[PDB]
Each structure stands twice: as C-alpha cells, then as structure tokens.
Amino acid sequence: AQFLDQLLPKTAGVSSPEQVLIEEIKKRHLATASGDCFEITGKAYNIDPLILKAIAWNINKNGTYDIGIMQINSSHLDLLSKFNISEDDLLNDACINISVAGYILASNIKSRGNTWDAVGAYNANAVELRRQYAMKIYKTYTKLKNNEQIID
Template identity: 40%
Template sequence: MSRPSHADCFDDAATYHHVNADVLRAIAWEESNNRPDARRTNTNGSVDYGLMQINSVHLEALARFGIGTDDLMVPCKSVYIAAWHLQRQMAKYGNTWAAIGAYHSATPALRDAYATRIAAKLNAIRDARENRR
C-alpha cells in the first residue's frame, strides 16, 4: 500500500489531537480508499465529504471553528478534522475499539462492525510497514 502525498498530515494531526496516526490511516482507507475527492450521500440524506468522509451531521459543530464543506474536501484539513472527531469519541468511550467504531456510528452493531474493519486495515498497515524493513 503506497502512502498518499498527504501522509505527513496523519502524523501531525494525530500528534496534535493525541490519537493514533495509523488508526487515522486505516480510517481513510476504509472510508474513501484514500481518495481525497470522495463524496457520498447516505440513505438518511446526510453526506460524507472528503478523504476521511466527515459526515454532514458534524457541520454545525465545525461551523463554530469556521469550517465548512469546502474545507472537508481539503485532504490535510480532513485528516485534522477526523483526528478531532476521533479524539471526541475517545473522550467519551476511552482509548477503546468502541471509540474507533464510534467514529462511524454510535449504533452498537454498526460501531462494532466498523471497529472490526478498522482493526483489519490497521493490521495490514502494520504488516506492510514490517515488510518494508
């Protein structure tokens, strides 16, 4: 798996928000297949934007920081926003798989399934890194 050109944003955002950079990388892989221009309309009418597929339900909270939908399509901003969102879930659930799953959904079944997918991607990222050594 090659690292996207915005790879350093993962490390910087993770450090700033005190989350794991590889978890952010796994989320980007799961959410958009590392595509910064990804956009998806969900069945409930909400929209996921950008590399990290930030959901429109967060727009009101993000607006307080001057962040709008155009910002969500900027890869590095998307990663920082995702790190902020993940950190909020960690504040609620602790440093757990539930927090990682809650990045996607608070519904337990969806949350747990998402966490399982992220765990698999995280293992693949770590395996790829080990194979490069």
C-alpha cells in the same frame, strides 16, 4: 474484553479535542499562507496515524453524508462552522479534513474511552454497525501495521 472494549494501539487521545483543533487549523492556515498530514494529526491528537490511514483507505441510512478523504459525517458541519470550517474547506484541503477527523476521533475517545468503540462511533442498528465498522478498520489497521513493521 469484548472487541469494542479493547484498547486502541499507541493512542491516548487528548484532554481537550476542541483546543487541539483550534491550534491545528491555525497551523494549517499559516502553512497554506507561507506558500505528512496523517503524521501531523496523529501526533497532535495522540492517535496512531495508521488508524487514521485505515479510516481513509476504507448517503448514509440516517440521511447524513460523508465528506472528503476521511469521510467526515455531515452532522458535524454545524459544530465545525463555529471553528470557521466550511464544507468547502473539508473538500478542498485534505490536511484540514484529516485534522477534523482527528478531532472527531479524539472526541469519541474522550467520550467512550480509548477503545475500538471510539472508532466504531466514527461511522455511527447502532451497536452492531459500530462493531462491523470498527472491525473493518481494525483489519486494515493490522495490515498497515504489519507491513510497516516489515519495512522498518
């Protein structure tokens, strides 16, 4: 179909993003207390870890801003406070940041389908900016996948 309607590679999502986030944050608080995050998150939310990496390796127009390694949009902070995830946690713990990004993408997949449109929505006028963003991620993704196939 159109790009935004084609399927994300090796990515199914989960039926309940919220339930997974709760479990993931628990596991990461314990691991910090017990004294690769892209892989852990990709497996927990059934997202290809290279899509997460592609997002990592790439103030907004509407006045929101981006936070930490996965550039979590500030519009999520209010929802995240209900999970006891603060802005400071997103800034000082890359693994929590990535688990949250997984949650957001997974929500997008539940909402839009497991298509490039779900990745476009991660950033977000709207339709075209989603497309440009998804295309950026798609390009980095293919490079990361290509490289990975060679060295495996």
